[PDB]
Design a protein around this ligand. Sequence first.
Ligand SMILES: *[C@@H]1O[C@H](CO)[C@@H](O[C@@H]2O[C@H](CO)[C@@H](O)[C@H](O)[C@H]2NC(C)=O)[C@H](O)[C@H]1NC(C)=O
Ligand SMILES: *[C@@H]1O[C@H](CO)[C@@H](O[C@@H]2O[C@H](CO)[C@@H](O)[C@H](O)[C@H]2NC(C)=O)[C@H](O)[C@H]1NC(C)=O
Ligand SMILES: *[C@@H]1O[C@H](CO)[C@@H](O)[C@H](O)[C@H]1NC(C)=O
Ligand SMILES: *[C@@H]1O[C@H](CO)[C@@H](O)[C@H](O)[C@H]1NC(C)=O
Ligand SMILES: [Ca+2]
Ligand SMILES: [Ca+2]
Ligand SMILES: [Ca+2]
Ligand SMILES: [Ca+2]
Ligand SMILES: [Ca+2]
Ligand SMILES: [Ca+2]
Ligand SMILES: [Ca+2]
Ligand SMILES: [Ca+2]
Lengths: 90, 90, 332, 407, 430, 278
Amino acid sequence: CCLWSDWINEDHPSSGSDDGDRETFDGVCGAPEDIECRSVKDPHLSLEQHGQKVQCDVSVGFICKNEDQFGNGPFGLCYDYKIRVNCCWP
Amino acid sequence: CCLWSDWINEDHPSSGSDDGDRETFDGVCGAPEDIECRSVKDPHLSLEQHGQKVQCDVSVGFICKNEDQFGNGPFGLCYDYKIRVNCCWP
Amino acid sequence: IYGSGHYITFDGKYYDFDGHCSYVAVQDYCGLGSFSIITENVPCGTTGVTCSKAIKIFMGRTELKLEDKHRVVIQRDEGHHVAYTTREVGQYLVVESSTGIIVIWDKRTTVFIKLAPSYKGTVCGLCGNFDHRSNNDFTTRDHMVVSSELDFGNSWKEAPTCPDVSTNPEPCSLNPHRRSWAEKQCSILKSSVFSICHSKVDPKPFYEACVHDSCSCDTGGDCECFCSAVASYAQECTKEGACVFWRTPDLCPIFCDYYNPPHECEWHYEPCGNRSFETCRTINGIHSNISVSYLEGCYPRCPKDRPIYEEDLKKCVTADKCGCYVEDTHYP
Amino acid sequence: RALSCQTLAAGYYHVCPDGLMDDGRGGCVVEKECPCVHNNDLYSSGAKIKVDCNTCTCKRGRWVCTQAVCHGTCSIYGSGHYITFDGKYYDFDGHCSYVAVQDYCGLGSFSIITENVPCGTTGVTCSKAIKIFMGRTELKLEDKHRVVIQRDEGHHVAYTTREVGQYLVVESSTGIIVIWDKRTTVFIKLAPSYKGTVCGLCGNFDHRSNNDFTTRDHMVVSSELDFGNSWKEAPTCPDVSTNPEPCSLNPHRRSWAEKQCSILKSSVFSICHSKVDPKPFYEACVHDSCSCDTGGDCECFCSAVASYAQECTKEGACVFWRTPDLCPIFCDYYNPPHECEWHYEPCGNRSFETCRTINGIHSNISVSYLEGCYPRCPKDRPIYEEDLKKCVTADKCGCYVEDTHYP
Amino acid sequence: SHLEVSSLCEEHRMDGCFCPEGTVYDDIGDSGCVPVSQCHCRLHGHLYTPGQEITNDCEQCVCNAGRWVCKDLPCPGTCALEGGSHITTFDGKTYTFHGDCYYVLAKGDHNDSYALLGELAPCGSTDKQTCLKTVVLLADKKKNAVVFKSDGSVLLNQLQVNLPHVTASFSVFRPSSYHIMVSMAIGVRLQVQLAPVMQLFVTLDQASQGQVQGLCGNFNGLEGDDFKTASGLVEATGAGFANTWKAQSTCHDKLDWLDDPCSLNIESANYAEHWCSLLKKTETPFGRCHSAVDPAEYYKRCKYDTCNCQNNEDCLCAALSSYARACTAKGVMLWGWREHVCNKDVGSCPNSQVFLYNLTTCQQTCRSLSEADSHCLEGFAPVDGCGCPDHTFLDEKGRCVPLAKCSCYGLYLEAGDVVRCVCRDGRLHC
Amino acid sequence: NVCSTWGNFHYKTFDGDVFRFPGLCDYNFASDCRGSYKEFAVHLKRGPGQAEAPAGVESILLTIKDDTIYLTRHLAVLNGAVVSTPHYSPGLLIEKSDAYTKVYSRAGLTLMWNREDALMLELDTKFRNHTCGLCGDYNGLQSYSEFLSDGVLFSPLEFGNMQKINQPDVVCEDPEEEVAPASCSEHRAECERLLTAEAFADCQDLVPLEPYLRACQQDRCRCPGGDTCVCSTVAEFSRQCSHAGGRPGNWRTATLCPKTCPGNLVYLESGSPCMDTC
Ligand SMILES: *[C@@H]1O[C@H](CO)[C@@H](O[C@@H]2O[C@H](CO)[C@@H](O)[C@H](O)[C@H]2NC(C)=O)[C@H](O)[C@H]1NC(C)=O
Ligand SMILES: *[C@@H]1O[C@H](CO)[C@@H](O[C@@H]2O[C@H](CO)[C@@H](O)[C@H](O)[C@H]2NC(C)=O)[C@H](O)[C@H]1NC(C)=O
Ligand SMILES: *[C@@H]1O[C@H](CO)[C@@H](O)[C@H](O)[C@H]1NC(C)=O
Ligand SMILES: *[C@@H]1O[C@H](CO)[C@@H](O)[C@H](O)[C@H]1NC(C)=O
Ligand SMILES: [Ca+2]
Ligand SMILES: [Ca+2]
Ligand SMILES: [Ca+2]
Ligand SMILES: [Ca+2]
Ligand SMILES: [Ca+2]
Ligand SMILES: [Ca+2]
Ligand SMILES: [Ca+2]
Ligand SMILES: [Ca+2]
């Protein structure tokens, strides 16, 4: 019993106050096995085909910072991301 | 050099997605000394004169949950809170 | 099709679908065909609800398109040219066809399609199949009757790369601060102003549409989302026999003396349309096949030295000097 | 040496012959017949223009104007915008009751109070009620109507309330005039006898604007927020510690606001661009439309575009900016069923006979620039009785005693 | 504090704890119904006792019974011409012009006294990219013309001069090679900035109040009549007022521009947002000035000039050095704001001298110690350039040696010469 | 008409004028220099230099009258947000095939770009005497005001450096004048035999031969070894063929620049994109 979770889009670039986009897995699971890191409005692109610089690991979750996206495109904003987590149940 | 911080109102009951009101001290300080726990629209009331049940300590910050305020008043919502932290600098 | 994704089929089934693609509204290419009407639904707001912003009408090889408060002719064929007619009746734009297809459009988001009763059981799309039996209107593109609003509506998208709608949004839950305004403005419908229509049209699905529409116009211009939802109910009231005068200078005002020659006062606000005057079409026998005398708007009351209203210039003219009307174009 | 009738007072530091000089219009002109320029228009000699109460004359390339002292105007409009009697623009978003004007300044005869409440969720406030204290009479402007509170026993300072266009106009016999568009915009006018004898959030009216930020304890500060927080009425009202930014707290409402409010800097208002500066009216309109996020934002918009078009009429440029899609107005609501007398006059300029002015009664200012719907009474009853919005015969109008219409 | 409440009292009377017949209630402190002549005043915090004076901006005030009694002190006024086109008059009143001519910036009204000109011509591609190019001063009964070109090159009556140049009626200094300081005996002081872009700062005494005309206004306290032309009436827009002050008759008339440059250029508007936002965030060394200067209007001009000009970093660093300039005018000096933003010239100082933020005229060589009362010219503002530390004054050429073997200034002799005056540390034994 | 770039830095204005500009920084491709109000602007950004033979495009920036479209190889961004294609807003259609990315605007603009190197633009006849980009002006006159402005004849290398865009952080060096090589006329027989084949029958009267064979001359002698520069010019000849209205035939054999697609998806020229899909 190691079913995947749902998609969690609980933050936005044009809202919030964390100056970017951060998606964490609290309220669902404690220590995951795997994490999937995709975008909302075009979900087949990898993280290397967006060109933005993020970190998305099983330890803390997802982090995008708007200050890191300076000089990359002409807009300088995070895209809208969403995540799954994989957790095993007895 | 142990100056108080500012007031941090970075969450609201009628917004967000944490089902209440939670104020944490990240981005300002790592391990505080003291924390002050007041309300926005009437800031001289103690936490025992609001009647809502909260936890507000130096470890994790401030937590109000809308499910804990059932049966207390006729409205059942958290009030709008704000915090200071005390940290010492060399 | 009206507001933030509300539907009523030809057999009278109400549902909600908030899709972001192009969708088949009506066609008779149903499993070869003669028309197709497409709707283009885009996000209007930030909550994920969508509303209709363009209509494409395919009749044979002619393609009209209703876009930016005007009609555009695209690809007029060589010698076939299925006879259609475009005129403006009140606040709405009305396209009619000689084959029995009638599209009525309030230039923002509300569309009314009408079909002659020769199209019984020969259409499909998001409007059903028009066979006077409403427990099969959720037939998908592959001829399967489903019970979900979201498996039916996701099968009539035009492009395969458009996404699937997996839930319907709740705007008054995603905008808690806009609920108190919406439920107070939209309570005109259940009030004593509309109390003549309360026994003739059920106000309850029009109250719920108005609150759904006003909680979700959160990017700008929400008093346009409101006044359209109150005029969808007052239109049914006129159609059933109850003329209600609901607009005031503070609530949804209308500006009909804009059209007057400088201070000669001929354009009046007729709140329920019911006036039959002489145009320069109907003086030469030309008549429509339905009754559009219930459409709200500003109507002329031409004087007694030129009592003939020429429609394509909004001018009252003498019965001799109006125009030509060949190939759906006004020639002076 | 090539003079130009515009560089007379410059000094000629760094064509026409000797004697003659250019005029900016054409050929070479003597110095005596030299024209005058005012707001990018060229006026020949002996021309007459008016400036707000005075009359000028182009004499010898210079203006010769009369010296009378005009009324002074304070403004309160939108989401916390002010203009003082001496012409100082600032922003203050306070949530209490505030002194707008009074002469109890350090004993007194009037007081005008504004009641500012939060309109939105971003923390900006707008004005929703006006209280006028004249002696012992208290008016109150609230819920689109005037209310009389505490009319005194035998003093009863003579005031008058009538409705001119879309606004409500209170006037007093002592020189105090309040003009109110029934939502958020207020205009206070004082007769020039009140020079240097008032205080509040509107300044002190002494034709010198670097002391308008005098606090209640008679101290000139440099902050908008130390000045405005000192004119609150209750001591338990909080202090405003920063001014909000609505288009930063609502990023999704910025694109609509900056596109709708760009009518002011467009070719529609291009006759007024040389006579009134559109730039502080563009910034007020965008600040107002990003912050009406709880409901009814097309009312916050149409008021900000009519604050600019009112100045344009007042300076001599009538602009017709409303369409059936942009801010429509409904003036044939008031007609007797299909007899068409109420017309939209976009710039007010019409002087018809009421049943006050047929009996000598006249005002002390000119309110013939106020937008709204005006009557055009027929020729079998050409006298407009104002307190019922009816055209009547000159005999059967009313009484007008103690500010009440008696038929 | 709120006296005379009962004259506007729309309530009836009830019970509760009150005051006696006189004896108003203490709001500012914490006591009870104290007498009226014991009311402690307040001023952003401190609880001033009734009688404690204070020295404010341009006035001094004493705490009377609850209210302040203030009395005026003499204080100057400053007209600024920053960017290519941002005029700030003597009475506030900031406006944008974009001209192409010589313009009268300030001149004395009597018949002669002085006249200060200035060229505002296009420097970039379009007409909306203008720059200051030449400052012309017509002083000493308008018979002496002084010209300040935008490469240094001060020249008097079409002839180059060597700096310093001290005369009887005026004097021109150059303390930091990108800064020229001009003082006049009439009461006029000039500061010409030369890098990154040319800017000008003018200072008058308050004796000349209501006695100047130009593009800097008339300096009378009101800012509603600064657009009053020299032929009567007040104009509406800045470009209609300023076409009346052309110093040449053959110049064309200019008009306003109701556009913003950050919409016409999409590539410049992200660079403008990222770097001009440092004036508003508090982690930077600009949040120290937020209690005094209120950067909300410098932020709007910083985005204006950055999106508009062709060399975007020279307009960024000029607009960041004008917030720091107008913050040192109110005490708060920003030591070290050039470490992340505009430090392309900090480390380029020579071998002995370093980059300073408080360089003034009277930190000069030992030749300045020879006069020591002739040319010091107090009353200016400190500027930022290459200079020597708290000791080791500047020698005749090159590095700055310490005080013992500085010089003996006649020609500046070395530290081995005996007249009977042995050359010594600064002073001479004569 | 049509402006176009392709291949190894080949350009083609609205009025012919095929030249070769090897600039690598950031340029203006076409723009509305009317003066009163700018309707559109198309900014081209060449890459860092892919190799000797190909010449890619890193990104395209496009601003139509209110809103900014940013196209890269993998994603399309409208006003800072990623769009799912097709995108149907009522003045702007943005759709993405397997080959091209199209942008259709109501202002009379049509952009079409395979995601490596070929970029073409189409404007209606409203914008005549107003365009000012590297695509020349749109007056209809062959080489009149693009290269001979005030009597002085501009070379194509100094015409391209005039069209540059200054970015306010990066200094990018203009390409210097190379030493004038030999006019490669020793391969005119191979370009004439190849491009006038039987597959290009009903386009010899539509599009000319002399510009696109002149561009074939440099692609044979500047790209030695493999043939990847000659089949981006005849691939551009079969796109100018099928834009005027003609229909070319298949020329790609198994030894003359083949292309591969998965399944039994055969490659063709001039077939309709509207497929019935089961
Ligand atoms: C109303 O419906 C009638 C019935 O179809 C339409 O009459 C047809 O008109 C077309 C050409 O206009 C003819 O080819 C058909 O033969 C007609 N039908 C019949 C039964 O004769 C009529 O055109 C419609 N009204 C309008 C205004 O279009
Ligand atoms: C306009 O101003 C005049 C001047 O004050 C007002 O006239 C005063 O009226 C009051 C009573 O109405 C008298 O007690 C004063 O003596 C009058 N003043 C003078 C100088 O005679 C006049 O009332 C004002 N107009 C209106 C309509 O109120
Ligand atoms: C400038 O400030 C520094 C403080 O670091 C100090 O050297 C001195 O106060 C000033 N230097 C002078 C006046 O030369
Ligand atoms: C300019 O005018 C029209 C379009 O405005 C164009 O057809 C014509 O060729 C142009 N003429 C010149 C001389 O540029
Ligand atoms: Ca966020
Ligand atoms: Ca997200
Ligand atoms: Ca919350
Ligand atoms: Ca909170
Ligand atoms: Ca059915
Ligand atoms: Ca004053
Ligand atoms: Ca002044
Ligand atoms: Ca040409």
